[PDB]
């Protein structure tokens, strides 16, 4: 409605998902996701291996935003940390 025409400086043409295991400082694996998706199922990740990840959003204006993230880092391997020994109420 009302045209809604505006050069919004936030239009992604493609998302590049780059991941590489911490045991490798070599090449990153690259997967390109269409610039209208918000999730990707990465196949080829080793279980129990720390990975480096980079989400590069290529915007139509040639604007590149690289969001660096990590995987296999949130290891909730709590060895039964019982601190509860006081009954409330």
């Amino acid at each position: 409605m009302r045209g809604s025409n505006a050069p919004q400086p936030s239009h992604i043409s493609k998302y590049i998902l780059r991941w590489r295991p911490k045991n490798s400082v070599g090449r990153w694996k690259e997967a390109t996701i269409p610039g209208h998706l918000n999730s990707y199922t990465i196949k080829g990740l080793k279980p129990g291996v720390v990975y480096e990840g980079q989400l590069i959003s290529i915007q139509q204006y040639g604007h590149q935003e690289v969001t660096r993230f990590d995987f296999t880092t949130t290891s909730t391997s709590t060895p039964g940390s019982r601190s509860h020994h006081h009954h409330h109420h």
Binding site: Y40, L45, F71
Partner: peptide
């Protein structure tokens, strides 16, 4: 350098549903 002072940078992607060799990585685009 940090040229992008505008908030058109995707927030930290969330990794859910971890399989043996696959994940679901979800990101929020501006």
């Amino acid at each position: 350098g940090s040229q992008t002072t505008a908030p058109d940078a995707p927030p930290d992607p969330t990794v859910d549903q971890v399989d043996d060799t696959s994940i679901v990585v979800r990101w929020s685009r501006p």
